[model samples]
Target: SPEFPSEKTFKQRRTFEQRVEDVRLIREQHPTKIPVIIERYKGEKQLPVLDKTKFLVPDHVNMSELIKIIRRRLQLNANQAFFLLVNGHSMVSVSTPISEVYESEKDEDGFLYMVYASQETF
Candidate 1:
C-alpha cells in the first residue's frame, strides 16, 4: 500500500504568497478563528504526520486542548510521549491561550507554525 508523502512540510509545499493570501482570506472570513499550520518534526520517525495541515483554531482554546486534539488525530497510544514546539524552538505554557501564542509567535506569513515530535523514553 502506498503512504502519503512525508517529505514536504506545509511551508515547503506552499509559496509565501499562497500562504499569506490564504491566511488573509481565512482571517477575514472567520474573524473569530486563528490560522495555524502544523507539521511533523522533520526528524520524527514514530509519530504519523497529521492527515490535514491547515487548522482554524478558536482563539480562546488553550494549548493543552490543542495538544489533546493533535494526540487524538494521531491516534497515539497511551504510553507514547508527544511534544509540540512553537516555531521549532520554544515550548509554551499549556495554560496559555492560542491567541497569546499567535500574537507572539506567528510567522511573517500570518499563521502560527508548530512542529510535533515523539521521543523514546529511557
Candidate 2:
C-alpha cells in the first residue's frame, strides 16, 4: 500500500511559497479563533485590560514590520538582549551571560517594569 505524506513531512519537503499556501489552505479549512495576547506593560508593570478595542492590529504588518513595531513598543535599547528556547526547555540550563537576562526596575508606586526593549521567547 502507498503511504500518504503527513502534514509535518509535507511541510518539511515544501518550498516557502508552497508552505505559505498550505498554511493558508489549512487556515481556510479550519475557522478557529487564535487568540492574540496583547499585554500592556509600563516597564515591568502590567496594566489591567481596560479596553478590548485597543487590541486591534495595525495596518500593513509583516514579520520585519511587526518586529520593528514590537521594538518601538518595548522601547528596546542598544544594550538589551534576548534568547529563545523550546517550550519545555529551562532557560537556566543555558550558559548565556547574566547581562542577557531581561532587567527591570520599580517606581515609587512599587510597579515593576522592564527598562529594556528586547523580548525573550520560549
Candidate 3:
C-alpha cells in the first residue's frame, strides 16, 4: 500500500509477492541437473561455452535469466541481438521455468537445447 499505491495496487502487490514465493521455491528445492547445450544454425556464429558446452543449472532458472546468462557468457555487446529457443517452442516467456520447458520441449539426451535464432527467421 505504501510502496505501490492505488486501486491497481493490491493486484500488483499480489503478483509481486507470488514471484518472491517462486524464487523461494527455486532455492528450497534440490535442482535437477539439466545439461544445457547451445547450438547454432549453418554459418551462424556461436556462443562460446568456455566453462562447459553443457550446464548443471537449476531447474527453476527463468527463461529470461537463462538468456541473460548466455549473453553474459558470450561477452556480446548489449546492443547485440540474439535469440534463443528452448527445444522448439514457438514462443517462450521470460518467467517460465527451465524445468518446465525441458519436460515439455526437450529432444532426447534430456539436454535443454538452445539454438541461435536467425534475424531472417526472427
Candidate 4:
C-alpha cells in the first residue's frame, strides 16, 4: 500500500544531475570491488600526485582529458606529445574506458596498472 511504501521509495525522484552522478560517479566500480593503479613512476617527467593515486577521477573520465591535465602541470611544449599505457605494451585512446584498460590483469591489489610517458613515441 502507498501508506506502507518505503521511505526511500516515497522520497522525491532524483533529478537528471543526481542520477547521472550515481551512474557515472568518479571511477566506476568493477561489479563490486576493483582497484585502479596509475603509475607516474618518476618517468621522463615529474607526475603529479592526488589524494588517491593521481586523482579521484570519474569512472568515465576520458584519456585525452587526462593528458591535458598532465600537460598543463608539466608545462609541456605544444610540439611535445604524450601517451598512457597498460601492460607496458598496450596503447590507450581517449575513447577507451578504464574498465577495459585494466580488465583481466593479474594483481594482488587488483588495481589497474597504467603507465604514463612523455618522451615515448606512439
Candidate 5:
C-alpha cells in the first residue's frame, strides 16, 4: 500500500490558521492529552500500515510507555525491531515524558510528529 501523507503535506494543503484551530480545538476537548501524529517510514515494507495517524495520548506517559502503546496497536512480535524516529532520524530518550517531547519538538501547528519502521532480526 502507498504510504500515508506526511503532516507537512496536510499542513501545506491547509492554512496555518486552520491547523492552529484544529490543535486549539483538540486541546480544549482533551486538555490532559498531547496531540501526536505517527506515520510509517516511507521505505518501510515489513510493518503493516497503521489505520489512524492522529493520537491524543496522556501527557504523563514516558517515551517507553508510548512505545508500548504503539507496539500493541501494531501487534508487533517480540523478535521484531520497531524504531520510532522524529524529524526523520532522531530518537528521543525513553525516560523523557511525552509532554517534554511535545514542548521541544511540536510543530508550529502544535502537534508532535513521529515515524516508525520495523525490521526482522537474525
Candidate 6:
C-alpha cells in the first residue's frame, strides 16, 4: 500500500509559468478596471510659472498632427481622448498630467518664460 500523509504533497511548487497562467485565467474570468496615470496640463485660465534661464517655444509638432500620430500608434478605443497643457518658456520641460502639474509658480514675476506641453496616453 502507498504511504499516505495528513496533507498531500505536490510534485513541485508552482513555477513562474504556472503562476502566470493562473493570473491570466483570473484576469480573463474577472475583468478588472485598472487606473493609469497619463499626462498633465494647466488650465487656460491659469498661467504656469516662468523661468528666465530656459527658453521654451510651442512644440514643433502641431497638436492636430500629434493627435493623428497617436491615434495611428496606440489604436486607442474611440472613447479615449488626448489633452495638452503649456508648461513655460524653457527649452526642456517635464511631461505630466494637468491634474498633476504644479499649480504654484516660483517666477511669476520673472521676465523670461519657459513652457512645455506634450501628448499624453491613458
Residue 45 of model 4 has an lDDT of: 46
lDDT of each: 0.85, 0.31, 0.57, 0.49, 0.79, 0.31
Question: 5-94 in candidate 6: lDDT tens per residue?
Answer: 432111124454664554355436543311111122333223222222121222343334434443444454566543433333321233
TM-score for all models, in order of appearance: 0.88, 0.27, 0.60, 0.48, 0.80, 0.22
Q: Let me know the TM-score candidate 3 reaches against the reference structure.
A: 0.60
Per-residue lDDT over 1-122 for candidate 4, one digit per residue giving the tens place of the 0 to 100 score: 47775322101344546544443543365354334445554434444432234244455655666567656765667876656666655454546644454455423334455556664443
Clashing pairs in 5: none
Total backbone collisions for each predicted model: 0, 8, 0, 6, 0, 20
Q: Give the root-mean-square deviation of each candidate in angstroms.
A: 3.4, 18.6, 16.6, 15.9, 4.4, 22.3
TM-score of 2: 0.27
Q: Judge candidate 5 at residue 13 and give its lDDT.
A: 61
Off by over 4 Å in 5: 1-16, 89-92, 119-122
**Highest lDDT against the true fold, candidate:** 1
User: Which tens-of-lDDT digit does each residue in 1-122 have in candidate 2?
Assistant: 14964223222454657645543554455334211222332232322221321112222222243334444555556464532222223233443322222122111222111221124432
RMSD of 5: 4.4
Cα lDDT over the full model 3: 0.57
The candidate with the higher TM-score, 4 or 6, is 4
Error of 3 at 58 (Å): 0.6
lDDT for each residue of candidate 1 in 1-122, tens digit (9 for 90 to 100): 15776488887889999999999999999988999988888888788879899999999999889988999999999998888888555453657889988999999999999888884221
Residue 75, model 2, lDDT: 58
For TM-score, candidate 2 versus 5, the one ahead is 5
